Amino acid sequence: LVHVASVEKGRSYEDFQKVYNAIALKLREDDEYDNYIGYGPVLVRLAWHISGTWDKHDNTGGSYGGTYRFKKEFNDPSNAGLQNGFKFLEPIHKEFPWISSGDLFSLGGVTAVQEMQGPKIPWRCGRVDTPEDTTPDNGRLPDADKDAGYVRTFFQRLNMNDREVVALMGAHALGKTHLKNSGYEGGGANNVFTNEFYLNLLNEDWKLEKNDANNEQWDSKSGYMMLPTDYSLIQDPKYLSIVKEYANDQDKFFKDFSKAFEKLLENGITFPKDAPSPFIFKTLEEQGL
Numbered sequence: 001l002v003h004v005a006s007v008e009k010g011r012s013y014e015d016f017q018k019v020y021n022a023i024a025l026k027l028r029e030d031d032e033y034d035n036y037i038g039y040g041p042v043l044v045r046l047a048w049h050i051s052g053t054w055d056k057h058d059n060t061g062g063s064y065g066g067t068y069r070f071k072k073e074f075n076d077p078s079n080a081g082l083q084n085g086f087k088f089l090e091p092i093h094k095e096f097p098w099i100s101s102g103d104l105f106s107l108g109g110v111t112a113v114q115e116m117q118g119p120k121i122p123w124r125c126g127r128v129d130t131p132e133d134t135t136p137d138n139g140r141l142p143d144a145d146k147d148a149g150y151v152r153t154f155f156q157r158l159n160m161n162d163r164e165v166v167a168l169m170g171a172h173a174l175g176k177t178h179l180k181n182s183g184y185e186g187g188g189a190n191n192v193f194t195n196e197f198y199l200n201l202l203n204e205d206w207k208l209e210k211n212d213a214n215n216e217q218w219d220s221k222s223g224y225m226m227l228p229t230d231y232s233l234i235q236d237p238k239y240l241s242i243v244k245e246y247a248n249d250q251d252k253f254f255k256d257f258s259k260a261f262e263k264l265l266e267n268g269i270t271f272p273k274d275a276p277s278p279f280i281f282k283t284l285e286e287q288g289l
């Protein structure tokens with residue numbers, strides 16, 4: 001199964017920078033969302049869930065086809081809460097109706113990471129909407145109640161190795177869990193992209209507690225929280241080495257996250273030899289906007 005990137009007709013870097021800017025300006029404007037976290041974290045999560053359905057074995061799922069717009073995928077229990085991200089992006093899509101849905105969802109994630117002072121994420125256009133019958137079934141996204149071996153095996157389906165997994169999970173510095181969405185709660189909240197996930201894992205005093213949905217999670221007296229799958233990264237000795245590396249080197253984490261996140265968002269896509277190079281968008285701050 002082959003998905004060839006096809007540039008939206010006639011479009012170039014400046015067209016996509018305008019879409020980036022409209023997302024980024026709306027991120028600034030709609031600041032009250034989720035007790036003033038704003039929409040940055042939920043857009044990152046959206047970009048990960050539309051990509052994380054990919055299966056390397058048959059090239060089903062993945063960001064290319066924009067299939068999150070269809071009911072089956074929109075209503076995945078694993079996607080609860082992401083409707084807020086979709087609603088945020090609706091007026092963007094209305095203003096730029098030419099961008100494909102996969103390009104818009106993935107660009108939302110890139111824009112959010114950068115606007116939250118994260119690394120630059122190179123981004124390529126050309127995802128093409130595919131029909132409703134190409135929507136992957138529910139159940140391809142990962143469970144949070146599991147251990148390191150589950151996490152490792154799960155991510156092999158996405159062609160990610162230990163380093164890529166540990167780097168990606170650093171996105172869990174962002175946002176928060178919501179009991180009504182996932183059955184997890186707490187850990188305060190954050191809308192600045194940093195390596196603090198790794199510092200918190202290593203430096204906090206963690207207690208295994210049950211939350212109000214009767215699920216286990218790791219809590220600290222400082223009010224932070226870790227999913228069982230988060231905590232598994234310091235229970236496994238190979239993951240632990242990489243956690244320590246990123247806790248001690250912000251720039252290395254940024255560079256590895258950028259590579260893994262781009263790869264995540266491009267899994268399943270064949271880029272023609274004469275496709276444009278990846279775009280690196282300027283932030284609003286770099287533009288003086």
Ligand code: HEM
Pocket residue numbers: 041042044045048080081142143144145151168169171172174175176177178179181182183184227229261
């Ligand atoms: C084993 C892998 C993963 C598991 C089990 C997992 C699970 C979860 C859960 C249960 C939540 C809370 C959702 C809610 O209640 O609203 C969450 C939030 C979040 N996840 Fe993950 N996740 C994983 C990997 C990732 C990856 C790879 C990324 C992106 C690179 C990511 C980005 C986020 C973000 C940004 C949020 C906060 C969303 C918000 O504040 O609305 N996660 N994750």
Ligand SMILES: Cc1nc2ccccn2c1N
Pocket residue numbers: 171172173174175176177186187188189190224225226227
């Ligand atoms: C702050 C924070 N953000 C997340 C996202 C996913 C899982 C846990 N998180 C915590 N504690």
